[PDB]
Amino acid sequence: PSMSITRLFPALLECFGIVLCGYIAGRANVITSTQAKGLGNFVSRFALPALLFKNMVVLNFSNVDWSFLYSILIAKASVFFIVCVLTLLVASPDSRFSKAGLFPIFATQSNDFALGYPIVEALYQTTYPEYLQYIYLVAPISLMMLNPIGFIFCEIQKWKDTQNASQNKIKIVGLGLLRVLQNPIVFMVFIGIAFNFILDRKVPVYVENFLDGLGNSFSGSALFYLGLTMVGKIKRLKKSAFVVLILLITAKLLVLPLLCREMVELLDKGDSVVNHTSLSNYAFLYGVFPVAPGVAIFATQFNMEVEIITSGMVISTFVSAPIMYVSAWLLTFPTMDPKPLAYAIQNVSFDISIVSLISLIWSLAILLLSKKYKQLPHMLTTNLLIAQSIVCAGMMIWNFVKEKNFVGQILVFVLLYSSLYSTYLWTGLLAISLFLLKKRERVQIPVGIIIISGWGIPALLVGVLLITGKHNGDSIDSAFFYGKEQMITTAVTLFCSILIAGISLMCMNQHCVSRCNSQSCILAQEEEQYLQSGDQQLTRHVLLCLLLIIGLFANLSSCLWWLFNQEPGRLYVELQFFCAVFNFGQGFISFGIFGLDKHSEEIKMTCQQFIHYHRDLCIRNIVKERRCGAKTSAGTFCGCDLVSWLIEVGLASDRGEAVIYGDRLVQGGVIQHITNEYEFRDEYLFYRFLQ
Amino acid sequence: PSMSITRLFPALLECFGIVLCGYIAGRANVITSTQAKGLGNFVSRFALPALLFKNMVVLNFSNVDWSFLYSILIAKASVFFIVCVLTLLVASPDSRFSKAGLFPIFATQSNDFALGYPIVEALYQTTYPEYLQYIYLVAPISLMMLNPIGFIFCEIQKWKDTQNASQNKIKIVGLGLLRVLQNPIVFMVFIGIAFNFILDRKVPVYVENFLDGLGNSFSGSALFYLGLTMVGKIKRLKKSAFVVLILLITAKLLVLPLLCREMVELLDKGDSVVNHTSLSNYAFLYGVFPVAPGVAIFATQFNMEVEIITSGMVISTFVSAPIMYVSAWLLTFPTMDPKPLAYAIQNVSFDISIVSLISLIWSLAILLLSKKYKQLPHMLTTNLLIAQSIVCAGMMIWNFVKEKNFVGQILVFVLLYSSLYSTYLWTGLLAISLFLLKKRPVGIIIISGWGIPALLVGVLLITGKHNGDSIDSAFFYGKEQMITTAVTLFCSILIAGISLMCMNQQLTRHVLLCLLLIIGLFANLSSCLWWLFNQEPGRLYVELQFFCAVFNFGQGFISFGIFGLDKH
Numbered sequence A: 001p002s003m004s005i006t007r008l009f010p011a012l013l014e015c016f017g018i019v020l021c022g023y024i025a026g027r028a029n030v031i032t033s034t035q036a037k038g039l040g041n042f043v044s045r046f047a048l049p050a051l052l053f054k055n056m057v058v059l060n061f062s063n064v065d066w067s068f069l070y071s072i073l074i075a076k077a078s079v080f081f082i083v084c085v086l087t088l089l090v091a092s093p094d095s096r097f098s099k100a101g102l103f104p105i106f107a108t109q110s111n112d113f114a115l116g117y118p119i120v121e122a123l124y125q126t127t128y129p130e131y132l133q134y135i136y137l138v139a140p141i142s143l144m145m146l147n148p149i150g151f152i153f154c155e156i157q158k159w160k161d162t163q164n165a166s167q168n169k170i171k172i173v174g175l176g177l178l179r180v181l182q183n184p185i186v187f188m189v190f191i192g193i194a195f196n197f198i199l200d201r202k203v204p205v206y207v208e209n210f211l212d213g214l215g216n217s218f219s220g221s222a223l224f225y226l227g228l229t230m231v232g233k234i235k236r237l238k239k240s241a242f243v244v245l246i247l248l249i250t251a252k253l254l255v256l257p258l259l260c261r262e263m264v265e266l267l268d269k270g271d272s273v274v275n276h277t278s279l280s281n282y283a284f285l286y287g288v289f290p291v292a293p294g295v296a297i298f299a300t301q302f303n304m305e306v307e308i309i310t311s312g313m314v315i316s317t318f319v320s321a322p323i324m325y326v327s328a329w330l331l332t333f334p335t336m337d338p339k340p341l342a343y344a345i346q347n348v349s350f351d352i353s354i355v356s357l358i359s360l361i362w363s364l365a366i367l368l369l370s371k372k373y374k375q376l377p378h379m380l381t382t383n384l385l386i387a388q389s390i391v392c393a394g395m396m397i398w399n400f401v402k403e404k405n406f407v408g409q410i411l412v413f414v415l416l417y418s419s420l421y422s423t424y425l426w427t428g429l430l431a432i433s434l435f436l437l438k439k440r441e442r443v444q445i446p447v448g449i450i451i452i453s454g455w456g457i458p459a460l461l462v463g464v465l466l467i468t469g470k471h472n473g474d475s476i477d478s479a480f481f482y483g484k485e486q487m488i489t490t491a492v493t494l495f496c497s498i499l500i501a502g503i504s505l506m507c508m509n510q511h512c513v514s515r516c517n518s519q520s521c522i523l524a525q526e527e528e529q530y531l532q533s534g535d536q537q538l539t540r541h542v543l544l545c546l547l548l549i550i551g552l553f554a555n556l557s558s559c560l561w562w563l564f565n566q567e568p569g570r571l572y573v574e575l576q577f578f579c580a581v582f583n584f585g586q587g588f589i590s591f592g593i594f595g596l597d598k599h600s601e602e603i604k605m606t607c608q609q610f611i612h613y614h615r616d617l618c619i620r621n622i623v624k625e626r627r628c629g630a631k632t633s634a635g636t637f638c639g640c641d642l643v644s645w646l647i648e649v650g651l652a653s654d655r656g657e658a659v660i661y662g663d664r665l666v667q668g669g670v671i672q673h674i675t676n677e678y679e680f681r682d683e684y685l686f687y688r689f690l691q
Numbered sequence B: 001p002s003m004s005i006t007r008l009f010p011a012l013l014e015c016f017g018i019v020l021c022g023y024i025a026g027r028a029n030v031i032t033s034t035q036a037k038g039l040g041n042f043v044s045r046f047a048l049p050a051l052l053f054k055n056m057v058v059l060n061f062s063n064v065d066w067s068f069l070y071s072i073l074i075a076k077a078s079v080f081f082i083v084c085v086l087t088l089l090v091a092s093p094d095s096r097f098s099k100a101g102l103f104p105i106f107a108t109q110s111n112d113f114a115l116g117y118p119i120v121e122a123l124y125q126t127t128y129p130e131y132l133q134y135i136y137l138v139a140p141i142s143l144m145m146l147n148p149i150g151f152i153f154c155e156i157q158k159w160k161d162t163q164n165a166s167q168n169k170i171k172i173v174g175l176g177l178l179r180v181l182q183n184p185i186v187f188m189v190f191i192g193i194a195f196n197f198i199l200d201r202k203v204p205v206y207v208e209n210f211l212d213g214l215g216n217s218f219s220g221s222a223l224f225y226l227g228l229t230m231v232g233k234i235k236r237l238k239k240s241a242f243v244v245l246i247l248l249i250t251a252k253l254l255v256l257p258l259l260c261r262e263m264v265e266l267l268d269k270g271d272s273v274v275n276h277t278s279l280s281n282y283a284f285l286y287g288v289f290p291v292a293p294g295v296a297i298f299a300t301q302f303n304m305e306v307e308i309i310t311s312g313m314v315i316s317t318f319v320s321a322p323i324m325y326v327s328a329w330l331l332t333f334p335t336m337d338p339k340p341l342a343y344a345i346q347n348v349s350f351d352i353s354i355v356s357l358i359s360l361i362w363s364l365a366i367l368l369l370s371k372k373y374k375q376l377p378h379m380l381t382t383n384l385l386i387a388q389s390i391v392c393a394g395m396m397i398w399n400f401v402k403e404k405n406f407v408g409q410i411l412v413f414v415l416l417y418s419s420l421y422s423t424y425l426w427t428g429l430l431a432i433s434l435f436l437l438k439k440r441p442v443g444i445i446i447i448s449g450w451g452i453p454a455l456l457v458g459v460l461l462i463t464g465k466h467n468g469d470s471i472d473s474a475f476f477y478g479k480e481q482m483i484t485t486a487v488t489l490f491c492s493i494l495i496a497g498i499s500l501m502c503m504n505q506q507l508t509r510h511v512l513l514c515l516l517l518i519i520g521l522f523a524n525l526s527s528c529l530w531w532l533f534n535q536e537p538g539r540l541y542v543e544l545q546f547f548c549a550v551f552n553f554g555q556g557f558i559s560f561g562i563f564g565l566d567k568h
């Protein structure tokens, strides 16, 4: 086909595994924020311009399609203009210019170098190599027209903040264009174009090796940097902020893509219709890319809200990973025979299932280590993830053994449908358990009968029905396995699950200071109770269920379409695709909720410097201790105030190096804990002072 | 020639250009030392393990010449057993084990992954694809043998602090090996070996792009990270340290490479002599690499004397750059006939000139900003750089202008031949000024400063004799230009010869500057008289032509040394 659909998942896995490595490295404090600044400066100043130089000097302008380029330009400008006029229509008067200068750049700019380039290369390395030219053309040019206007609006916003002196050209457009030229995305392009014209598209050999060495090491490095720059950014936004963020994200990932698709459809007049359709769908894969670091730093320097822009950047990447997957596949979907349609559905389900099962096995291991199965609903949550992993394992075993073997073993691996029914109805079980949580303490419904009813899912009755029901005749897929009665079984069961979820949503609407072991440190029990209460994270379970509900609606709609009328029309194929991505990427969302969730000499100089200077800086005032246990009043202090003290006077840069410093003090015997056994973790827990 | 030496210079321009790009970044403080560790963890913990993981998995062991792998190992071991015993008797007993525990590992480790892989690839990416495997076998096996002997050696140093009673199993070997496995590279070998057999020497597609996407991001990043680890490392230790630096450095740069070439000759028994010759010169080409910063940081975790190693990290990186270049040319010289050798000397002259020009621009600009026109002989030295800038300026005109076109294009060289002679005289009349400085006018010297009697040779280019083949500076018309080449230098040298006696009877630094080039002038003196007596190379006159090239074109490299690292 026009795209390397097989190589979509290897490339997405590459970029997102690297970005996840960055995320975990940032969260594991192996590379703090200040340390990550070094990688950011490297990838900005050195690696990226060399890549542009190498790919721009050899750029052949004689065989480019300016029509498609201008089409993507006019689509991006239309999105910019539409969002700008809507923002100017409705916004805070004191911030309308700020919004109309920052949201359009967020809805038009995208990370087309670090993320877009590997994907488009893996899709077009052998089919349409010219797309590598068009990726390095469209982005820089789009970075010289729209974001200038955005900077202009930023200047209008600052002039609202500063009366200025009638600077129609001194400040309105001066620094507005200046901020465009000083970026390595514009002036470096100018230099590359000048050298491309100077030379005969032949970079000298004596510089080719150096440029290749400095350019081949930018993709992974920039992805890693984005990973370490996606740490501590998903904050809590108000209802207005949340809705504005949703509007912007849906715009950047749906509206602009279809706008580019339609512009390419109507403007292009190429004789080859097949290449025109290929180019149009390529334009559709364009746009769904998440925003670039550029919008985040642009917000940062101007000192606007920033929070909205970076939150949009995180949520755009996270939802752009599956959106790029489904969009590309749906774009390859229109032209193959029905049998390759079914085989491709099986393949994508297998891939999403195996990766989602690796993630879920990690989550299960971390849950078993966490031992959160005490008095929290965590037990039923982790059992549901255990069921999802069973669903994935059934997927893999169904993959390798299908349309062969004997009927017996066939049903032996078709029993994964029982686990899948249990998954649907375990989302409803999560709903009713939250309903009990809203009820008074000691809810009539215990946890044992809840589990018995859950894994006692009537999918066993579905097994009885399939024993009584008709046998499989073709079994080309799990859905059309042994007839249409299973469709009724899935529709009914999932309808009960979604009804239970709706009921739950309605209910939602409805005196020894030195030593503190026994005579003191009785607040350790209170602190561990607080830690367990923080471990009680039913809010993320709520996020889970109300995130699943929409997909459950999708599957029930698909089934009702099939039994309602026997007219697929290729629409039921995409409905099957959405059902498959749900059922076999449940692991991905569960990992998004759990697993990636909360809950020698150098030490000597660290401790000496501290105890000699920072101790003198009112260490009694800093170590704020209140009613230490039941004997002393001033024995132990919270670490949050400690990290605040480090990051408020300039002792430590941020909380990462500060927590590392506290670890150093722990290893140096200068700071202690309430029980003297635990280790410093920068939390409300009270901490002793070991002298 | 199996080694594509034409690609040797571009490879060297990449490995040392990037670290210089990092080094200048560290100097500018754009990426400070504290912020450097962010890149350091990426290469060490992520980029390096993925790079090893991918290749090892696809690595085939049946098609491996184990003789070459053994040869370097016992060559790395032979140096290992030699240096330790020398330091175990002559060094102070307070730290004999430390000097026999980290110096012998400082003289056998190398930057195989950072500075080594691109260079070995650039010369054998097509001719000898197998040579890109032993780079990933010789080094990791070296992490298997020698570093444990060195690690346990540091334990007796700790045993000096904490005597206890012969804690052999406790710390001497209880921590010596722990310093091995914990190192990220070495553990990756076992995992790569394990997966080499679990899978049929293939990497799963689902992470193949993950590894390749992360593996390729090591070469550029590792070279860059070396730059920020080099700023503020060279210190003053001339009391008694410098002398031992050349002993450790020449062990890795001279002693170790010599055996590797020799022992592989008596070990490898391949039928193809040419292949064995490639394996011989590859054994030499291995070991000239600069020592890896793992040794530089190994001392940091062992908190012992670091200065000798961290300075050994910076100097070995610089000194490795020419040796890897000049030496590799020498082995290739006997193989080729004198037609490409005449092109090779032309190519090597064109190569050294480019890098030297960067120093000349650096030095001639800093003196202008520092106002070195002062009455001291400094203002003379500036004109040396202006004269020396033209020296390499015409060297590029060799390739894309000369050897073709017209004699008029050849005649643009007369400025560079006068400039080539100008430096010969300019260092000469520079002595006249210092002659007056040590005796109790400059105006007389100034009027002769730009007089350039080489312009009197200008008539010799027009009327002395019609142009000959004209492929090189000395290769122009007959030997009359070499007759005049003979006259220009010895006159300058004979004035310098009586200044040292006159003295017996940074102004002082310029005296050292003349002495450094006076050896090349003596070398050129021999170069200017050998052909006159007889035009027979004899395998020796060729190597002084190569010594002539590194003197004539590329003499500003030392010149920047006097005027570099001072910074007002």
Ligand SMILES: CCCCCCCCCCCCCCCCCC(=O)OC[C@H](COP(=O)(O)OC[C@H](N)C(=O)O)OC(=O)CCCCCCCCCCCCCCCCC
Binding pocket: A041, A044, A045, A046, A047, A049, A050, A051, A053, A182, A183, A184, A188, A191, A192, A206, A207, A210, A214, B013, B014, B016, B017, B018, B020, B021, B024, B025, B030
């Ligand atoms: C014949 C020799 C063969 C090769 C041998 C090796 C050659 C060594 C020399 C190579 C150049 C090294 C320069 C070292 C000095 C430091 C450079 C440096 O870091 O400056 C910085 C610039 C990067 O642009 P910026 O506008 O500042 O970035 C702003 C951005 N928003 C940010 O803050 O993050 O950084 C730069 O961009 C400067 C270039 C750094 C190298 C990276 C690739 C450049 C490719 C493009 C070359 C043409 C354009 C040059 C523009 C110069 C800009 C200063």
Ligand SMILES: CCCCCCCCCCCCCCCCCC(=O)OC[C@H](COP(=O)([O-])OCC[N+](C)(C)C)OC(=O)CCCCCCCCCCCCCCCCC
Binding pocket: B234, B242, B245, B246, B249, B250, B253, B254, B315, B319, B322, B323, B326, B327, B330
């Ligand atoms: C059959 C056998 C065939 C063998 C063929 C071999 C051909 C190639 C031979 C090349 C010899 C290389 C010698 C390197 C010098 C060893 C000591 C050292 O590290 O010095 C660096 C010295 C001493 O190191 P240092 O560490 O004391 O000084 C550092 C000083 N600061 C901190 C200010 C930088 O460093 C220098 O000052 C110079 C650095 C560049 C050196 C470049 C080469 C100079 C010329 C060497 C001799 C080669 C030409 C004469 C022909 C001889 C042929 C054998």
Ligand SMILES: CCCCCCCCCCCCCCCCCC(=O)OC[C@H](COP(=O)(O)OCCN)OC(=O)CCCCCCCCCCCCCCCCC
Binding pocket: A082, A083, A086, A087, A088, A090, A091, A092, A099, A240, A241, A244, A247, A248, A250, A251, A252, A255, A305
């Ligand atoms: C029709 C749906 C189809 C599905 C795809 C989505 C298409 C959406 C098309 C309609 C867009 C809605 C426009 C109006 C949204 C509501 C704006 C609003 O209420 O403005 C004020 C509100 C809060 O204001 P306040 O609390 O005072 O300040 C908070 C500052 N952070 O918020 C603000 O602070 C205002 C921020 C700037 C103004 C935002 C609204 C204008 C821009 C809308 C862009 C929509 C993007 C969709 C793409 C299609 C084309 C627009």
Ligand SMILES: CCCCCCCCCCCCCCCCCC(=O)OC[C@H](COP(=O)(O)OCCN)OC(=O)CCCCCCCCCCCCCCCCC
Binding pocket: A024, A355, A356, A358, A359, A362, A595, B191, B206, B207
């Ligand atoms: C598609 C294939 C996917 C394969 C996934 C499974 C990979 C592991 C098993 C297969 C082997 C391949 C990797 C082998 C090299 C491992 C190198 C290593 O040491 O990694 C472990 C690392 C360091 O810690 P460690 O050395 O364990 O600590 C000392 C031990 N006493 O790390 C640690 O153990 C530290 C503690 C954990 C920190 C990282 C966990 C954060 C969350 C990661 C979740 C994702 C992991 C799976 C990827 C799929 C995600 C969709």
Ligand SMILES: CCCCCCCCCCCCCCCCCC(=O)OC[C@H](COP(=O)(O)OCCN)OC(=O)CCCCCCCCCCCCCCCCC
Binding pocket: B082, B083, B085, B086, B087, B089, B090, B091, B092, B099, B103, B240, B243, B244, B247, B248, B251, B255
């Ligand atoms: C009773 C002993 C009898 C003699 C036995 C050993 C003979 C050979 C010794 C090595 C050969 C080189 C000669 C020694 C040069 C040492 C450097 C020097 O000139 O400084 C003298 C200084 C003496 O002071 P010391 O008490 O050692 O401690 C100094 C504190 N830094 O010394 C030092 O600073 C010592 C520095 C550490 C040790 C350096 C020597 C080992 C490393 C270089 C090995 C070179 C290998 C060459 C292989 C060639 C093979 C063909």
Ligand SMILES: CCCCCCCC/C=C\CCCCCCCC(=O)O
Binding pocket: B012, B016, B020, B230, B234, B314, B318, B321, B322, B325, B352, B355, B554, B557, B565
């Ligand atoms: C004569 C050598 C020919 C080969 C040239 C190799 C290219 C690299 C050469 C040397 C780089 C010099 C690095 C800058 C020196 C100052 C840094 C410092 O002293 O710390």
